[PDB]
Enzyme design. Sequence first.
Site, short mmCIF file in Angstrom:
data_model
loop_
_atom_site.label_atom_id
_atom_site.label_comp_id
_atom_site.label_asym_id
_atom_site.label_seq_id
_atom_site.Cartn_x
_atom_site.Cartn_y
_atom_site.Cartn_z
CG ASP A 1 8.36 52.93 17.31
OD1 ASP A 1 8.98 51.87 17.49
OD2 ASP A 1 7.31 53.19 17.76
CG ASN B 1 16.03 46.31 17.44
OD1 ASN B 1 15.94 45.23 18.24
ND2 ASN B 1 14.95 46.50 16.91
NE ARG C 1 -0.88 47.45 8.58
CZ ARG C 1 -1.02 47.05 7.45
NH1 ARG C 1 -2.34 46.82 6.92
NH2 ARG C 1 -0.03 47.01 6.68
CG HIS D 1 1.50 48.09 15.08
ND1 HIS D 1 0.68 47.09 15.39
CD2 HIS D 1 2.96 47.94 15.41
CE1 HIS D 1 1.50 46.10 15.89
NE2 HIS D 1 2.79 46.56 16.00
NE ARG E 1 13.60 51.85 15.07
CZ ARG E 1 12.51 51.55 16.08
NH1 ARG E 1 11.72 52.45 16.53
NH2 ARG E 1 12.24 50.37 16.36
CD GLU F 1 9.94 48.38 15.00
OE1 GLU F 1 9.16 49.28 15.35
OE2 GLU F 1 10.12 47.53 15.72
CA LIG Z 1 -2.06 52.11 14.63
CL LIG Z 2 14.66 48.88 14.39
#
Ligand SMILES: [Ca+2]
Ligand SMILES: [Cl-]
Length: 496
Positions: free
Chosen positions: A197, A298, A158, A201, A195, A233
């Site tokens: 992305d 995807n 992260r 993370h 979405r 995601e």
């Molecule tokens: Ca991050």
């Molecule tokens: Cl996706």
Amino acid sequence: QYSPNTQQGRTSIVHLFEWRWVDIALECERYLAPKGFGGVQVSPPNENVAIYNPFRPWWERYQPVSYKLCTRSGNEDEFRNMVTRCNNVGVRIYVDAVINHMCGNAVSAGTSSTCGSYFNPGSRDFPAVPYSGWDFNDGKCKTGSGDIENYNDATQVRDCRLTGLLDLALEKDYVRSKIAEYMNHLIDIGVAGFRLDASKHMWPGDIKAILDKLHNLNSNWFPAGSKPFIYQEVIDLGGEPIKSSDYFGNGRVTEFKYGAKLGTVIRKWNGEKMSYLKNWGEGWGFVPSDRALVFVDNHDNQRGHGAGGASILTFWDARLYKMAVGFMLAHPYGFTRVMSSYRWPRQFQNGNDVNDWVGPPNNNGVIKEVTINPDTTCGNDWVCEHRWRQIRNMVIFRNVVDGQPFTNWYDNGSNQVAFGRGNRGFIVFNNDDWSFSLTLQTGLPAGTYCDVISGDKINGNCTGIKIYVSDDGKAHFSISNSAEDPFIAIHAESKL
Ligand SMILES: [Ca+2]
Ligand SMILES: [Cl-]
Ligand SMILES: *[C@@H]1O[C@H](CO)[C@@H](O)[C@H](O)[C@H]1NC(C)=O
């Protein structure tokens, strides 16, 4: 966050990967609305780095330079025009929000961006936002390289850079507000959701703080109190300390185990067979259906850039792909996303496609228009899977059986299975190396039905196979393993 906000009776969205806004607007009116598609996932609409080596790869769009709505897909006016025209016809727009990072730390400073904005990765300066060295996780990351080096450490996943991409300090209110300002601008324009992305993370809590700053949907098209649809995601196959369940409080999550397992089952890899799909869904260790965004492939993993790797089915595997998408669209689990791609010159060297970076069809970098052939297929190298009869008709099939229970399952203990959806639909599959010829219980009302895979019901007649259901709901099905499409689907509205 959990409802798509689609129009009542529209159950799927399509990812029109790398399409220009003007083409999407046209497509909403000429095809998506009439055919019953619920919405469109568009590629990132914010300014990104223009990468010339390799030449304009698809992934340059995941390296933000600013939040200006200026990309190879079009400008702000064209973006607005598209959202308005699509909404006016009942087709929603979902934005791919790239909010975990900016561009690669190694990218050169200058104005090589899609809108000419100046940026300097080295000094962490993105004046067009603006962001500075204070808005990145440089001092929080604890790895020697500053990049993510080990996924078994949830903290570095992260706080460190995903393969060098400058990592935004999302715990800072200033950063959260710049992102919310961007997303609210889009919500007010009329988009129905996002979405998120690279959600794996970002800390679930930082995402939530951002979502708490978002507006309700535009009251000109949406009922009061409507919250944006959120799907995160998160690639969670097994074995990592980060679980997609950690993000349930924020919205839905992409279930990557879905396409991965469907691919191995349909390819019949390592002893797997279609009869095993009897308890498909949570029974396979997938997330709860009301938190799942499912798909077969995807934009990342169709070119080997993601979860599932080798088993993933794509348009290149047309016959098997149609069958997998068909099974996905007929099964009650999750909210379905259909893929729409472009052809690129695959080129396998040592098992790796050395041309997986190739961007959309273009003339000197300018993306080509989607052209429609007389038979409704597309030209200019756009594959337009969503226009394939077998796929388009299954999109409609899902709409027709929306809400019906999964019933009347049959399997031959191998790769010949069938099931119905209440009394509104029935589908049969033959993935065995021999023919299928059996009389099955369909749960459907007596009548003659057009098979929507091989044909269409066109003015009182079927253009392909016809099925005859007797008074007791029974019908005979024959599918030879040599058929171009080894499966048959009939539903309430293909009834003659
Ligand atoms: Ca991050
Ligand atoms: Cl996706
Ligand atoms: C179905 O097609 C046949 C001709 O091929 C014709 O006899 C019949 O009228 C058609 N039915 C309708 C409703 O057009």
